[PDB]
Symmetry: D2
Subunit: 291 residues, 4 copies
Amino acid sequence: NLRGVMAALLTPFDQQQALDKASLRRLVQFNIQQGIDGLYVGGSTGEAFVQSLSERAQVLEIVAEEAKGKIKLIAHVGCVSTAESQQLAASAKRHGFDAVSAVTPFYYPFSLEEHCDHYRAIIDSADGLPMVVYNIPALSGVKLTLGQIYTLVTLPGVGALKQTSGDLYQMEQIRREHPDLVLYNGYDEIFASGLLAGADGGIGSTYNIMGWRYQGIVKALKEGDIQTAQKLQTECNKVIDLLIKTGIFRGLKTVLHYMDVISVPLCRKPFGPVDEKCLPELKALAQQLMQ
Amino acid sequence: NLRGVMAALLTPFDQQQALDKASLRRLVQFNIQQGIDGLYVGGSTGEAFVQSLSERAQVLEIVAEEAKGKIKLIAHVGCVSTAESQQLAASAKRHGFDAVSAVTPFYYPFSLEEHCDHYRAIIDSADGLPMVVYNIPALSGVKLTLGQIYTLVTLPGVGALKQTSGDLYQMEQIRREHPDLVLYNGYDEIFASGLLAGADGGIGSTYNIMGWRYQGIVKALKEGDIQTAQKLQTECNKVIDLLIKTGIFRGLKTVLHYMDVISVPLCRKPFGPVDEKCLPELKALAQQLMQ
Amino acid sequence: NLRGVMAALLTPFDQQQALDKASLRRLVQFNIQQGIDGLYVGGSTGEAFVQSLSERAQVLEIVAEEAKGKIKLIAHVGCVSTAESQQLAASAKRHGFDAVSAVTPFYYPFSLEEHCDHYRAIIDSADGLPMVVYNIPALSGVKLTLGQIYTLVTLPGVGALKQTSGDLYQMEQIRREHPDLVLYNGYDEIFASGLLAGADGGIGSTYNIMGWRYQGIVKALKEGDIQTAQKLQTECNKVIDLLIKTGIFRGLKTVLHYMDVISVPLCRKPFGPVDEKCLPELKALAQQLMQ
Amino acid sequence: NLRGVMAALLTPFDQQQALDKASLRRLVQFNIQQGIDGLYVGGSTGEAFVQSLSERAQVLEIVAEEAKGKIKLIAHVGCVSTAESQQLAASAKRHGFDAVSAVTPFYYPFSLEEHCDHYRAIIDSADGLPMVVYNIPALSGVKLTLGQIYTLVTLPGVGALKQTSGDLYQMEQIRREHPDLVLYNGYDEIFASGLLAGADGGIGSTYNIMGWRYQGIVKALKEGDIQTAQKLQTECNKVIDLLIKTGIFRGLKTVLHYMDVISVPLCRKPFGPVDEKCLPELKALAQQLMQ
């Protein structure tokens, strides 16, 4: 029941870089109205790694008040520390999320065995909530082989893998060895290709502004309309080329600010403001998506 | 007119590691009988880099003898040396190949300017044959950015790009920037996803023993039967998994030996022999391929 | 006055993973007794990335209580978040440290200007304490160029650079460009070579158990006796060889526990316990070091 | 008796990019005039990968005729092909070279076992000449582990390792493991540091225009005077910085030309020409070295 298209939720801040609750509530609602299947919260996109544990739990609490019952909720409780991750797993459960997820612990190198214990511990603290193993080499620096992936996803309590890797040979080997595994395509720019290789859904940050297109790509491939799938993917890719140039999170928040969802589109330091020169393309995009 | 599905041709040898002329003609014939659209000869797969210019020009000659007019023919002409590359390019036209191709020169680091001159010089010597730039970062060590690729494929005389890269975001970006460029998918393992991304054909080493499967995928995608395409790609990938374990070239030659095509399944040193323990799966692979 | 050999301090925990203050004090005193020039506290070795801010500030406080005025004290105040880093810099000034330091913010990619602004802000908060830029590509994933290093190293308030990089061409290039820069060699396994290249001194994990050997390498090069300098480096590398196999932090802690300096040799999860098979060698190492 | 400083020999060419025999001999004798212990010929620096086998053999001969006797002579005989490597090996014996050498075969990926059989075959064809294994990750793309290096250098017939790696911890581990092994430092910019870590000699391209400085470093460390070893390496690096900016092989030949050793400082295609804006620096350098 976790298969699907889930937006990786952004965290709106106020001018003082404090949580902007009203914009967070707006953002959750905006996503629901968009037809999203669920939300992945407290992930990279939520700026979790520049947030405190209490701040991350406050967010989980607010979106559950806002979305529990309406759409699927996955809480990324991942920290480098197993104990901090367990604390967040207990809050996700306490607030009613449908699953937890954790990036592979980073900075310090850990063995495959250390990664398994880390996941086992979080799973135990999740008290029943399935675990979403999260592989994202580019940001974490943890290069996971297919064999290591097999070990992690076969752990008791692991019901899914968020694959943020562009290796689509591995995407299909994973699907072939694990037929029942929920597999989330992680890179928005290769979504269509990801689904064809074996992913059965996706989690992405750009879904916050055009989640309807990814759902569109999914319907297309289902209705055997490769052509429409391709057109949707390239329109997504033109937006991603832009976001990548502007700063992905700040870029997304800016489009959202112009759509009246977010009050102040600031990311937390050390992230800087969006380059003034980008605002016109961003303003235009906002206009274009609203219509 | 050169867009399509082209097998990267293997160079058969005898026990003394010398070109086995008779097996070569048999292999070329076998490829044609599978309904392949053309042959990419003298590339990585034809063991070009452990062959002299004269043995390379000799294979060009024989294959052209065997298939000029029957199917399209692309001659890979690259060498680290610009002058040796030019020399093979003249043989290509001289033997009537439809196009010429050249891997980005490797080992020594070269600038973008130096790489362009390398292709211009070769283009000059190909005397009218369109050039197929060849990007294969994993083996050449040359990682081309989107812009370096832009600069190279827009070189006068360049009519295509062989993209042996698993980055399908780059694949669609290239397509979106060069809508008229011929785009061959380099990694067989991701063929279906590659076409979906924007590639309009493919060149691959495994097409030698199951090229029809890739044709079946082209057709299935055109016909909107995504299901069969995936099925086909899965079946191709089960085979590729095996070949990567056994060693790809020697594994393909061994299979072609069980199909009668090749007499002696040897690659040239430093390539070592296939593992005796592998031969049952390879023999059985051949058997079922006789489907 | 910041030039010298400083031990990268470990953080002793109890069986319940909480700070072991009595062992922390012993370790500080142990290092002072070894004739160490100072301590670098709250860095990677202190397991700072699996500690909360409050915990990190508590360690800063206890170490100053034990060592202020006795040896130099540098506070690694860095976090990905600029704000958290500022909070730690203020605690460092509050407790009387001689300097502050911060690793290049990681996980999320940041531009050079974003990095400069992070350091400036932290420098502001340190209220007078100079800054030691910390470059450690292997763990952070940020491989600075000599150019970026120059920009960071020239920021107002930056008094030194901790170079945990094995590229000794860059070390001498940095020394050539900044003849007045305190340059700490960060990879213990190449200390002698690093010093020869231009390193001014060093900061390291292994200094906790054999800091006198590093002091010996300094003196030997100062006396042109490259013969004993290599002897010393060789002994250090046989130990580093073992530590890398056992897990560095836990191996150091195990040796320190066997030397009755710390009560419990555990690291926080996800680091796992030392493999029982390694204990015989760690016990013997501890024995010989004590002599 | 192979230990020592050996210049990696450039191969002068004429305007037609053909071998400039008179300039070759002039360079050979010029290295002798400097006081080199031997010359490493037919390697990266000799532009061997952009030369035919016969051209390579021809160079081996001219150099031998000019030097079999006055200095030590090592013949880089490596090709991707083992057979081509064996051919050059036989020629190495024929002109009476002191030792043979071969880069790990590149481009295609090969197993340790294949690399092993490749070296055995060449050793064999070297007819008793000792083999120098050549590890140069950055150009070959072959990253050797300590364990792989161990297997290779303990192959019967192997007498040395040319280590073109900036990993000085690996350098020291190699020395500790094979104290009888001749270990050549491959990167000129870290010569001082490299010998300190355990290399007993060195092979470099910049030795051609300043072999004496390297010889001076070796003596300076023997006489236990790190002071002038550093100052010497600093000078070598100020120069190396320039050769990197200008293009190394072309930058060295150009200096040699202003020193009246080589007729035309041209490298073969795809190497481009030296930027006209650099000539003042290169002349001024050619001027200062002359003393």
